[PDB]
């Protein structure tokens, strides 16, 4: 098994949250670090009109609220809401700074996740800068197809995903998502089989 | 004037890069960490057609090429180009991982810069998703006029930047930048005094 996590978790409080609950309130003062024992979450930023953007999906095995760890007086950089019911560990920054001196691997794992997040977020900047809505929705589909949650299909990878949520990822209305998907079918690039979406040539 | 940082540099091998040189190409196998002693660099990504986007500006006191540190077999995720002449400290991941075990403070310092970079890059995501090109150019000029290299001017603040570099930051053609600037002058919000730009306010 993993003694390091075990060791890490023995210094945490664990708490459970129902689906759709807000784990992190943007703007708040950061003093605590979190680790997802079970579940999945969305990280998201808002427009001044209430519009929500989904930055990132995090799951079992992810730290959360780590960005304020390295400087005192930081505030949460974004919102995090419980995608499913979650089981979440919690430890203060101070205590977590102490664990680091005993075993820096826990910091390595955390920074490993920051590095990954930075790479992917950077790619998202690129999509936003270089691609129109159509292009962005295509890359979004290709990426979801590459996920392990992607069911295998004769014609390609099969994903299940809401239009609304596709909109929150690329930054457009769900109506716009729908019209674009319908065009991608016509172009014979995907299929919209009721619930799922089959991404051809994946 | 910093015990840990010197301690860190003492293990580094220094290299100098002339302006406009590329320290890191995207795709390379990551096996080295960098630290900027002097100078400034641009981190950027290219598009399949060659269009360039500036992700971040890094300066004296910034690690570079740290994203490949935590997993092996990784590849450099972007290009880093010398914006000026640079004095850069360098060290292998292998030897760097040992510095961590000896003193994890050096990791905390590294990780602290990574944290900031994620916040600012997520902010950029917001910028691009919620603001039209006009919006982004305005915001950009403001941010530039709040810089320390922002010379002072009686009408406001003055900055020196090309339209090319403005489009690389906000993601538009240099012909788009020009057109938007003309409009900002029309609104008496800036002045195109040749090379430089006066930002009223
Ligand atoms: N671009 C991103 N990719 C992944 N996780 C993010 C991103 N932006 C913010 N987060 C997470 O959102 C959390 C909310 O507040 P913190 O800044 O405390 O810590 C944050 C990060 O863990
Ligand atoms: N630039 C944008 N234009 C429209 N909706 C956006 C934008 N950026 C983010 N969104 C969000 O994306 C969501 C997708 O579908 P909704 O109609 O539910 O509501 C949408 C908005 O909240
Ligand atoms: N969004 C970003 N903000 C700051 N620095 C970045 C960003 N994206 C990439 N870099 C730097 O670009 C470097 C090039 O390759 P690495 O992945 O080795 O390490 C990278 C980071 O140091
Ligand atoms: N979406 C974009 N459209 C056009 N140029 C872009 C875009 N995103 C980044 N760029 C870059 O921005 C640069 C600014 O001026 P150029 O026309 O010289 O070349 C441009 C491109 O390399």
From Swiss-Prot, chain A:
Residues 46-52 are annotated as: Activating region 3 (AR3). The gene is crp. A global transcription regulator, which plays a major role in carbon catabolite repression (CCR) as well as other processes. Binds cyclic AMP (cAMP) which allosterically activates DNA binding (to consensus sequence 5'-AAATGTGATCTAGATCACATTT-3') to directly regulate the transcription of about 300 genes in about 200 operons and indirectly regulate the expression of about half the genome. Changing residue 52 to G/K: Reduction in activation of class II promoters. In the apo-form the DNA-binding helices form a rigid body in which their DNA recognitions helices are buried. cAMP binding causes a coil-to-helix transition, stabilizing the active DNA binding conformation by reorienting and elongating these helices, which precludes a return to the inactive state. Interaction with SpfP blocks activation of some, but not all, CRP-dependent genes. This is DNA-binding transcriptional dual regulator CRP. The record marks 90, 95 as: Activating region 2 (AR2). Residues 173-179 bind DNA. 3',5'-cyclic AMP 1 binds at residues 50-56, 65-67, 76-77, 121-122. Residues 131-202 form the HTH crp-type domain. 3',5'-cyclic AMP 2 binds at residues 129-130, 164-174. Homodimer, which upon binding cAMP is able to bind DNA. AR1 of the upstream subunit binds to the C-terminus of RNAP subunit RpoA, AR2 of the downstream subunit binds to the N-terminus of RpoA while AR3 binds to sigma-70 (rpoD). Interacts with SpfP. Residues 147-156 are annotated as: Activating region 1 (AR1). Changing residue 153 to A/K/L/N/P/Q/R/Y: Disrupts AR1. Decreased transcription activation (3-45%) at class I and II promoters, binds DNA. The keyword Repressor applies. The N-terminal domain binds cAMP and is responsible for homodimerization, while the C-terminal domain binds DNA when cAMP is bound.
From Swiss-Prot, chain B:
Disulfide bonds: none annotated. One of its GO terms (biological process) is DNA-templated transcription. 3',5'-cyclic AMP 2 binds at residues 129-130, 164-174. 3',5'-cyclic AMP 1 binds at residues 50-56, 65-67, 76-77, 121-122. One of its GO terms (molecular function) is DNA-binding transcription factor activity. Residues 46-52 are annotated as: Activating region 3 (AR3). The modification N6-acetyllysine is found at residue 94. InterPro entries: cNMP-bd_CS, cNMP-bd_dom, cNMP-bd_dom_sf, Env_Response_Regulators, HTH_CRP, RmlC-like_jellyroll, Tscrpt_reg_HTH_Crp-type_CS, WH-like_DNA-bd_sf. Residues 173-179 bind DNA. Changing residue 152 to A/I/N/S/V: Decreased transcription activation (15-87%) at class I and II promoters, binds DNA. The keyword DNA-binding applies. Changing residue 44 to M: Prevents SpfP from blocking galactose operon induction by CRP. In the apo-form the DNA-binding helices form a rigid body in which their DNA recognitions helices are buried. cAMP binding causes a coil-to-helix transition, stabilizing the active DNA binding conformation by reorienting and elongating these helices, which precludes a return to the inactive state. Interaction with SpfP blocks activation of some, but not all, CRP-dependent genes. The N-terminal domain binds cAMP and is responsible for homodimerization, while the C-terminal domain binds DNA when cAMP is bound. Binds 2 cAMP; cAMP 1 is in the anti conformation, while cAMP 2 is in the syn conformation. This is DNA-binding transcriptional dual regulator CRP. It comes from Escherichia coli (strain K12).
């Amino acid at each position: 098994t993993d003694p390091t996590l075990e060791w890490f978790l023995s210094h945490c409080h664990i708490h459970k949250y129902p689906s759709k609950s807000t784990l992190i309130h943007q703007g708040e003062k950061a003093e605590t670090l979190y680790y997802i024992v079970k579940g999945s979450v969305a990280v998201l930023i808002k427009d001044e009109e209430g519009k929500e953007m989904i930055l990132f999906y995090l799951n079992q095995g992810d730290f959360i609220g780590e960005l304020g760890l390295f400087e005192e007086g930081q505030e949460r950089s974004a919102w995090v809401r419980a995608k499913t019911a979650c089981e979440v560990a919690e430890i203060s920054y101070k205590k977590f700074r102490q664990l680091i001196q005993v075993n820096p691997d826990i910091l390595m794992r955390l920074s490993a996740q920051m590095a990954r997040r930075l790479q992917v977020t950077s790619e998202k900047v690129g999509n936003l800068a270089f691609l129109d809505v159509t292009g962005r929705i295509a890359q979004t589909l290709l990426n979801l197809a590459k996920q392990p949650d992607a069911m295998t299909h004769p014609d390609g990878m099969q994903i299940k995903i809401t239009r609304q949520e596709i909109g929150q990822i690329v930054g457009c209305s769900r109506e716009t998502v729908g019209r674009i998907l319908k065009m991608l079918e016509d172009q014979n690039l995907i299929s919209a089989h009721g619930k799922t979406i089959v991404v051809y040539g994946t």
